[PDB]
Amino acid sequence: PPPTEVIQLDWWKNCVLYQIYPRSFKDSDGDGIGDLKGIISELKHFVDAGVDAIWMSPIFESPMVDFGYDISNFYDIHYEYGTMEDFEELLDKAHELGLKVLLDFVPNHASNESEYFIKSEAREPGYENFFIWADPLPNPENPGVRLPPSNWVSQFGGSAWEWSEKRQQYYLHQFAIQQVDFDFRNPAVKQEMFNIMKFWLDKGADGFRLDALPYLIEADPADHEGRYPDDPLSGLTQFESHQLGYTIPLYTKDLIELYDVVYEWREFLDEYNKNHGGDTRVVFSQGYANVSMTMLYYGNEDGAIGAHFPFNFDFITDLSSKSNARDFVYIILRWLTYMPYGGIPNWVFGNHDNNRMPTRFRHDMVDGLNIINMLLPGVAVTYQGEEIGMRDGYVSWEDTVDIEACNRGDPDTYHLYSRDPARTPYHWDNSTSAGFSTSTNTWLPVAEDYQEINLAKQKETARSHFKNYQALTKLRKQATLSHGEYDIRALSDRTFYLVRSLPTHDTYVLLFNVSERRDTVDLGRVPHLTLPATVYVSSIHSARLAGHEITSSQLSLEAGEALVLKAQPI
Amino acid sequence: PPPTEVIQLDWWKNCVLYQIYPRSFKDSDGDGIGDLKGIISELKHFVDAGVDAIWMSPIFESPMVDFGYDISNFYDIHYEYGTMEDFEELLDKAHELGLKVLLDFVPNHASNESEYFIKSEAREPGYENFFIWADPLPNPENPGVRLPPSNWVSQFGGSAWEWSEKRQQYYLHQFAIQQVDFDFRNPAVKQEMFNIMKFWLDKGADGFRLDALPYLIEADPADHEGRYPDDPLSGLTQFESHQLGYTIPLYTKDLIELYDVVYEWREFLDEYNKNHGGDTRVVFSQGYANVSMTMLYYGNEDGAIGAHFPFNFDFITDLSSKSNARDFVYIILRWLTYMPYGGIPNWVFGNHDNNRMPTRFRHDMVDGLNIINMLLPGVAVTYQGEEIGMRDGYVSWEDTVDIEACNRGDPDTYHLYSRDPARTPYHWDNSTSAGFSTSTNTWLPVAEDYQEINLAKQKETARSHFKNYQALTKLRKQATLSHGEYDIRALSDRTFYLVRSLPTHDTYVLLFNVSERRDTVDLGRVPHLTLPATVYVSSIHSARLAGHEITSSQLSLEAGEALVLKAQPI
Ligand SMILES: OC[C@@]1(O)OC[C@@H](O)[C@@H](O)[C@@H]1O
Ligand SMILES: OC[C@@]1(O)OC[C@@H](O)[C@@H](O)[C@@H]1O
Ligand SMILES: OC[C@H]1O[C@](O)(CO)[C@@H](O)[C@@H]1O
Ligand SMILES: OC[C@H]1O[C@](O)(CO)[C@@H](O)[C@@H]1O
Ligand SMILES: *[C@@H]1O[C@H](CO)[C@@H](O)[C@H](O)[C@H]1O
Ligand SMILES: *[C@@H]1O[C@H](CO)[C@@H](O)[C@H](O)[C@H]1O
Ligand SMILES: [Ca+2]
Ligand SMILES: [Ca+2]
Ligand SMILES: [Mg+2]
Ligand SMILES: [Mg+2]
Ligand SMILES: [Mg+2]
Ligand SMILES: [Mg+2]
Ligand SMILES: [Mg+2]
Mutate to test the pocket of ligand 1, among A184, A259, A260 (most ligand atoms within 8 A of CB): A260
DSSP string, A398-412: TT---HHHHHH--TT
Chain B contacts of A489, Cβ < 8 Å?
A: 337
Q: Which residue type does A219 have?
A: A
Same domain as B79, residue B129 = no
DSSP string, A233-250: B---TT--TTSTTSB--T
Give the Å distance between the CA of B169 and the centre of ligand 8: 17
Chain B contacts of A234, Cβ < 8 Å?
A: 235
Closest Cα partner for B417 from B406, B430, B429? B406
The angle that helices B325-338 and A325-338 make with each other, rounded to 10 degrees, is: 170
Give Cβ neighbours of residue A217 (< 8 Å, ≥ 6 apart).
A184, A185, A255, A257, A258, A261
Q: How many CB pairs under 8 A join A and B?
A: 38
Contact criterion met (CB below 8 Å) for B500 and B561 = no
> Is B333 in contact with A338 (Cβ distance < 8 A)?
no
Chain A contacts of B337, Cβ < 8 Å?
A: 326, 329-330, 333, 489-490
- Which ligand is located closest to the Cα atom of residue A288? 3
In a domain, A524, yes or no: yes
**Residue A29 annotated as binding site:** yes
CB of B235 within 8 Å of any CB in chain A?
yes
Chain B contacts of A233, Cβ < 8 Å?
A: 237
Strands A562-567 and A533-538: antiparallel
Q: Whole-angstrom Cα distance, residue B176 to residue B525?
A: 53
Range of A548's domain?
485-567
Closest Cα partner for B186 from B264, B116, B124, B129? B129
> Is A489 in contact with B333 (Cβ distance < 8 A)?
no
**Residue A108 annotated as binding site:** yes
H or E element in which residue B101 lies = strand B100-105
Last residue of a domain, one of A227, A253, A279: A253
| Pocket (CB within 6 angstroms of ligand 6) | B 66, 69, 106, 175, 179, 211-212, 352-353
Helix (H, G, I), strand (E, B) or coil at B550: strand
In a domain, B6, yes or no: no
Contact criterion met (CB below 8 Å) for A559 and A527 = no
> Is A490 in contact with B337 (Cβ distance < 8 A)?
yes
Last residue of a domain, one of B444, B469, B494: B469
Mutate to test the pocket of ligand 4, among B153, B155, B418 (most ligand atoms within 8 A of CB): B155
Same domain as B228, residue B308 = no
Same domain as B424, residue B495 = no
Q: Whole-angstrom Cα distance, residue A291 to residue A337?
A: 10
A260 Cβ closer than 6 Å to some ligand 1 atom: yes
CB of A290 within 8 Å of any CB in chain B?
no
Q: Give percent helix, percent strand, percent coil of chain A, each to the nearest 5.
A: 30, 20, 50
In a domain, A557, yes or no: yes
In a domain, A146, yes or no: yes
Q: Which of B241, B341, B487 to mutate to test the interface with A (most CBs of A within 10 A)?
A: B341
Same domain as B461, residue B432 = yes
Nearest Cβ partner for B235 among A235, A329, A489: A235
In a domain, A120, yes or no: yes
What resolution in angstroms does the PDB record give?
1.6
CATH assignment of the domain containing A147: 3.90.400.10
β strands within A463-561, DSSP E: 485-490, 495-502, 505-513, 519-522, 533-538, 549-550, 554-557
**Residue A31 annotated as binding site:** yes
In a domain, B3, yes or no: no
Contact criterion met (CB below 8 Å) for A34 and A23 = yes
CB of A493 within 8 Å of any CB in chain B?
yes
Q: Which residue type does A7 have?
A: I
Contact criterion met (CB below 8 Å) for B304 and B322 = no
B185 Cβ closer than 6 Å to some ligand 2 atom: yes
Nearest Cβ partner for A326 among B236, B338, B489: B338
Q: φ and ψ at A412, to 5 degrees?
A: -100, -20
Strands B53-56 and B16-20: parallel
Q: Whole-angstrom Cα distance, residue A55 to residue A94?
A: 11
Strands B109-111 and B161-164: unpaired
H or E element in which residue B24 lies = helix B22-25
Which atom of ligand 6 is least distant from the CA of B179? Answer: 5
Give Cβ neighbours of residue B518 (< 8 Å, ≥ 6 apart).
B556, B557, B558, B559
> Is B237 in contact with A234 (Cβ distance < 8 A)?
no
How many domains does chain B fold into? 3
CB of A491 within 8 Å of any CB in chain B?
yes
DSSP string, A51-116: --EEEES--EE---TTTTSS-SEEEEE-TTT--HHHHHHHHHHHHHTT-EEEEEE-TTEEETTSHH
Beta bridge partners of A522: A554
CATH assignment of the domain containing B514: 2.60.40.1180
Q: Whole-angstrom Cα distance, residue A114 to residue A102?
A: 23
Same domain as B299, residue B406 = yes
Which atom of ligand 5 is least distant from the CA of A108? Answer: 5
Closest Cα partner for B542 from B522, B562, B519, B564? B562
In a domain, B393, yes or no: yes
In a domain, B289, yes or no: yes
CATH assignment of the domain containing B348: 3.20.20.80
- Tell the burial category of B514 from Cβ atoms under 10 Å away from its Cβ (0-12, 13-18, 19+): buried
The angle that helices A257-276 and A187-203 make with each other, rounded to 10 degrees, is: 40
Distance from CA of A570 to the nearest CA of B (A): 14
Q: Which of A237, A331, A337 to mutate to test the interface with B (most CBs of B within 10 A)?
A: A337
Mutate to test the pocket of ligand 4, among B21, B108, B288 (most ligand atoms within 8 A of CB): B288
Closest Cα partner for B443 from B25, B161, B51? B25
Closest Cα partner for B487 from B471, B510, B504? B510
For B110, other C-beta atoms within 10 Å of its C-beta total 28
Same domain as B328, residue B212 = yes
Q: Whole-angstrom Cα distance, residue A260 to residue A305?
A: 10
Same domain as B36, residue B17 = yes
Same domain as B260, residue B165 = no
H or E element in which residue A360 lies = helix A357-360
For A161, other C-beta atoms within 10 Å of its C-beta total 23
User: Cα–Cα distances in Å, from A556 out to A302, A563, B561?
Assistant: 50, 11, 47
Q: Whole-angstrom Cα distance, residue B341 to residue A199?
A: 57
Last residue of a domain, one of B418, B443, B469: B469
Same domain as B19, residue B143 = no
Same domain as B401, residue B269 = yes
Nearest Cβ partner for B341 among A333, A334, A491: A491
Q: Whole-angstrom Cα distance, residue B194 to residue A409?
A: 56
Same domain as B342, residue B230 = no
Same domain as B445, residue B522 = no
